[PDB]
């Protein structure tokens, strides 16, 4: 009837009103990978923070051992607007607490070589390692 479609579409318009409010509420980013060989990642799990100087710049994904050289190869998640980073970098695993999350906190520097600057983008495997601290060995050799 005349009361049918005017009310039934009214139940349909409000059904799509809040559903459009359901998806628009709380609103991912294309990046590039960065391979990394290490010595100690015990405590660093997946989606752990990558930070340059402390500000988080990406997440640790893809965690698996390269099963031919037994050096832990992990590719990171670094955004594609990062196109002006020189090769001079140290790769340190920090914790920010005694047991916080063991997040990767790598160092960068703009030390330009006089042979040219190498760029770190789209799959540049890094060769620098912290060999993350073994606190058992730290206090252990401190007392003999």
């Amino acid at each position: 009837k005349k009361n049918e479609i005017w009310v039934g579409i009214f139940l349909l318009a409000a059904l799509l009103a809040a559903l459009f409010v359901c998806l628009k509420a709380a609103n991912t980013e294309p990046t590039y990978t960065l391979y990394a060989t290490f010595d100690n990642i015990g405590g660093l799990k997946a989606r752990s923070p990558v930070s340059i100087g402390g500000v988080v710049v990406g997440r640790v994904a893809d965690i698996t051992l390269d099963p031919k050289t037994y050096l832990p190869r992990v590719t990171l998640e670094i955004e594609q607007r990062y196109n002006h980073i020189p090769d001079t970098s140290s790769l340190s695993i920090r914790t920010s607490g005694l047991l916080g999350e063991q997040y990767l906190a790598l160092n960068v520097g703009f030390e330009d070589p006089e042979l040219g600057t190498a760029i770190l983008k789209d799959g540049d495997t890094i060769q620098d390692t912290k060999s993350a601290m073994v606190l058992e060995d730290l206090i252990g050799q401190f007392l003999y």
């Binding site: 009837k1 009361n3 049918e4 479609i5 009310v7 039934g8």
Partner: protein, 257 residues
């Protein structure tokens, strides 16, 4: 469209039942607040809906507390905190399962069997002959039953939480090796009175207004043949069971928002 006219009958029909539910209940609680007749009349109705519904609550209440004390005991031990059991099952019962499960079983036993007595009383025309007696039955037979619900279910919840929390204090303390003085101790400073203890009643007393109204309405407009009445009983259980969860999600938003 040819099929959209079949919905045009329903959109008018399903709203007129809501008009009948208000109009029946409004006539049930207006005028002549007599108390000489109703005070023995009502107390026979509490034997119908309060005493017979009492046994099912307590024998199910010991099973919920024994399960939550058993299942909760694994989750605390993996996080290595024994004392939290007393502030867990006290927490979980008094704000989540206490109002929700007791109202479910009340819709089960007392919710359905009340609707059976109403529709049967119209099926043998005990209702239609009482109008020849010139006594208005909605104040006479409905309002003794309606007040018999909303008074009962708060007293059905406080018996449920207490015997529920006692069974929780068995399997953790006695059987699974916890000191008795330690268990109540974390429970003492666990919960307050103003937004927890009276809050259990607010969730429970607003359920009794719905379930008693949704039960006694379905007895009043059911088809008086023997087929339509049992259809109305299984329409009462399914409609209260949505309304208890349709309210609880709202009533858990205000208290904890």
């Amino acid at each position: 469209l040819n099929a959209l006219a079949s919905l045009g009958h329903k959109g008018i029909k399903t709203l007129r039942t809501f008009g009948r539910a208000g109009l029946m209940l409004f006539n049930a609680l207006v005028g002549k607040p007599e108390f000489r007749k109703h005070a023995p009349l009502l107390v026979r109705q509490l034997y119908n809906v309060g005493v017979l519904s009492m046994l099912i609550i307590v024998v199910s209440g010991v099973f919920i507390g024994m399960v939550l004390g058993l299942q909760g005991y694994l989750v605390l031990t993996t996080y290595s905190a024994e004392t939290s059991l007393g502030m867990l099952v006290a927490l979980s019962l008094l704000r989540e399962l206490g109002p929700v499960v007791a109202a479910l079983l009340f819709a089960g036993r007392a919710g359905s069997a009340l609707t059976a007595e109403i529709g049967l009383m119209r099926a043998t025309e005990q209702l239609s002959s009482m109008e020849m007696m010139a006594v208005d039955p909605l104040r006479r037979v409905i309002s003794p039953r309606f007040w018999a619900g909303v008074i009962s279910l708060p007293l059905l919840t406080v018996i449920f939480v207490a015997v529920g929390i006692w069974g929780g204090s068995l399997v953790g303390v006695s059987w699974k090796g916890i000191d008795s003085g330690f268990f109540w101790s974390a429970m003492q400073n666990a919960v307050d009175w103003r937004m927890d203890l009276v809050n259990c009643l607010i969730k429970s007393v607003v359920f009794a207004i719905t379930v008693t109204w949704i039960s006694l309405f379905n007895g009043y407009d059911a088809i008086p043949t023997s087929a339509g009445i049992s259809r109305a009983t299984t329409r009462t259980v399914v409609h209260s069971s949505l309304a208890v969860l349709g309210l609880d999600f709202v009533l858990t938003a205000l208290m904890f928002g």
